[PDB]
Design a protein around this ligand. Structure first.
Ligand SMILES: *[C@@H]1O[C@H](CO[C@@H]2O[C@@H](C)[C@@H](O)[C@@H](O)[C@@H]2O)[C@@H](O[C@@H]2O[C@H](CO)[C@@H](O[C@@H]3O[C@H](CO[C@H]4O[C@H](CO)[C@@H](O)[C@H](O)[C@@H]4O)[C@@H](O)[C@H](O[C@H]4O[C@H](CO)[C@@H](O)[C@H](O)[C@@H]4O)[C@@H]3O)[C@H](O)[C@H]2NC(C)=O)[C@H](O)[C@H]1NC(C)=O
Ligand SMILES: *[C@@H]1O[C@H](CO)[C@@H](O[C@@H]2O[C@H](CO)[C@@H](O[C@@H]3O[C@H](CO[C@H]4O[C@H](CO)[C@@H](O)[C@H](O)[C@@H]4O)[C@@H](O)[C@H](O[C@H]4O[C@H](CO)[C@@H](O)[C@H](O)[C@@H]4O)[C@@H]3O)[C@H](O)[C@H]2NC(C)=O)[C@H](O)[C@H]1NC(C)=O
Ligand SMILES: *[C@@H]1O[C@H](CO)[C@@H](O[C@@H]2O[C@H](CO)[C@@H](O)[C@H](O)[C@H]2NC(C)=O)[C@H](O)[C@H]1NC(C)=O
Ligand SMILES: O=c1ccn([C@@H]2O[C@H](COP(=O)(O)OP(=O)(O)O)[C@@H](O)[C@H]2O)c(=O)[nH]1
Ligand SMILES: [Cl-]
Ligand SMILES: [Mg+2]
Length: 331
């Protein structure tokens, strides 16, 4: 093709599919891929995030700096994996106190990790390392890898997390992967999972799924992707703050990640991997990624049959969760 990502992905396809038959690694090449500055038309005028994405696309072998290797010592029913950034201490603590608390009702173990990269001083971030170490020692729920935690590296955050599931939590029944600014009704999710047949549970992947979306071409927008980077439509994908899937599918997704080049939008990348497995993510009405009706925001009964709501502040998560604990008496 003409777009850089599509062209390189087609090269990967030929490498993994003999039926298409008629030098540097794409997985552990971690020097700058200087060839991109000549083959990508207008490279020098792209925003810095695109330059860095294209230069280091072929590197994904990053190591854990903070690990919790025994997080799944007891086999989880539901692993909560929450994407976060170093300075988001209040968001993480609110989640710990509310919908993300670990629990074991009915022997269905719920365990929690936060997913971080580095916020390094050479990028002008304040040094919060001692505070992060303090939080990690106390709460034992931080996983942190040695890559730059940026918007366009979130598909790295996804691949490295899936790698961690395969190495350190391969027996979890289900995975919820979400953002640290959503409210999640964990009780409703557990009730939903216990209503699933084994057949439906095996390849479960639900969220707020969008079909036939394409890249935004408006250069001002957060999710802007230039025509020189990607052409065509996006596969169906769950986006908007969280999605829910089986541990069995987590392992299959991890295996397939080597065959898909990283993409600047993490939720599109996950949709690409699901597509390569031959699966279609399923839309579920309980994922409210653009909130609920203004007058309903005040009523706790509005939250009882929801799976998640985007977005809520730390104080709102705790207030909602607390009211929810007695919602069966009022709704
Ligand atoms: C959830 O998992 C539970 C186990 O996990 C632990 O507990 C939970 C609550 C969490 O805290 C988790 O973190 C823990 O890891 C599980 O609990 C277990 O359930 C079984 C079955 O009910 C219990 O077995 C009973 O054991 C007692 C003690 O037996 C010993 O002493 C007698 C001497 O009297 C000897 O004969 C025995 O060989 C043992 O050496 C038995 O008295 C009892 O026997 C009766 O029931 C059986 C089964 O019908 C009959 O065959 C007998 O004839 C008796 O009528 C049970 O065998 C076990 O104690 C219990 N563990 C704990 C730690 O409580 C729980 O069932 C899971 N499910 C739910 C919904 O919680
Ligand atoms: C996703 O996350 C990954 C992993 O963290 C990021 O990859 C790193 O990206 C940074 C840039 O942000 C890379 O650092 C840069 O490397 C350049 C190349 O270094 C090589 O070449 C020079 C010269 O030949 C050698 O001296 C050097 O030792 C290496 O062999 C450097 O030229 C850059 O230098 C510039 O910045 C530094 C520090 O700010 C200054 O001192 C310099 O003067 C100059 O201004 C810079 O160091 C880093 O190598 C990447 N790491 C890995 C493991 O690949 C991605 O950027 C990130 N992606 C997105 C989209 O955010
Ligand atoms: C990923 O693995 C590769 C391959 O082992 C590592 O590449 C070496 O590491 C650095 C990065 O360029 C250099 O010192 C070596 O010359 C690299 N080349 C080779 C051939 O090994 C790479 O470092 C790893 N990436 C990370 C982030 O750990
Ligand atoms: O560099 C980043 C930026 C975002 N996030 C996390 O990813 C989620 C998505 O971020 P954001 O809410 O800004 O995206 P949006 O909802 O606006 O699409 C948030 O929970 C952040 O904590 C991250 O982990 N690293
Ligand atoms: Cl915060
Ligand atoms: Mg958000």
């Amino acid at each position: 093709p003409e777009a850089y990502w599509n062209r390189e992905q087609e090269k990967l396809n030929r490498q993994y599919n003999p039926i298409l038959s008629m030098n540097i690694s794409h997985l552990n090449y971690c020097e700058p891929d200087l060839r991109v500055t000549s083959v990508v038309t207008g490279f020098n005028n792209l925003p810095d995030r695109f330059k860095d994405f294209l230069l280091y696309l072929r590197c994904r072998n990053y190591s854990l700096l903070i690990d919790q290797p025994d997080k799944c010592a007891k086999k989880p029913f539901l692993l909560l994996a929450i994407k976060s950034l170093t300075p988001h201490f209040a968001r993480r603590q609110a989640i710990r106190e509310s919908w993300g608390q670990e629990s074991n009702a009915g022997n269905q173990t719920v365990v929690r990790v936060f997913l971080l990269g580095q916020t390094p001083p050479e990028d002008n971030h304040p040094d919060l390392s001692d505070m992060l170490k303090f939080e990690s020692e106390k709460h034992q729920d931080i996983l942190m890898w040695n890559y730059r935690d940026t918007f366009f590296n979130l598909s790295l955050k996804e691949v490295l997390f899936l790698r961690w599931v395969s190495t350190s939590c391969p027996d979890t029944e289900f995975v919820f992967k979400g953002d640290d600014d959503v409210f999640v009704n964990t009780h409703h999710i557990l009730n939903y999972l216990n209503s699933l047949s084994k057949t439906k549970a095996k390849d479960l992947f639900i969220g707020d799924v969008i079909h036939n979306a394409g890249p935004h071409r408006d250069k001002k927008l957060k999710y802007y992707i230039p025509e020189v980077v990607y052409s065509g439509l996006y596969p169906p994908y769950a986006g908007g703050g969280g999605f829910l899937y089986s541990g069995h599918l987590a392992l299959r997704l991890y295996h397939i990640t080597d065959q898909v080049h990283l993409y600047p939008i993490d939720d599109v990348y996950t949709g690409m991997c699901l597509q390569k497995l031959g699966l279609v993510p399923e839309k579920h009405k309980g994922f409210r990624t653009f909130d609920i009706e203004e007058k309903n925001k005040n009523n706790i009964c509005s939250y009882v049959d929801l799976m998640l709501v985007h977005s809520r502040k730390p104080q709102e998560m705790i207030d909602i969760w607390s009211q929810l604990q007695s919602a069966h008496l009022k709704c």
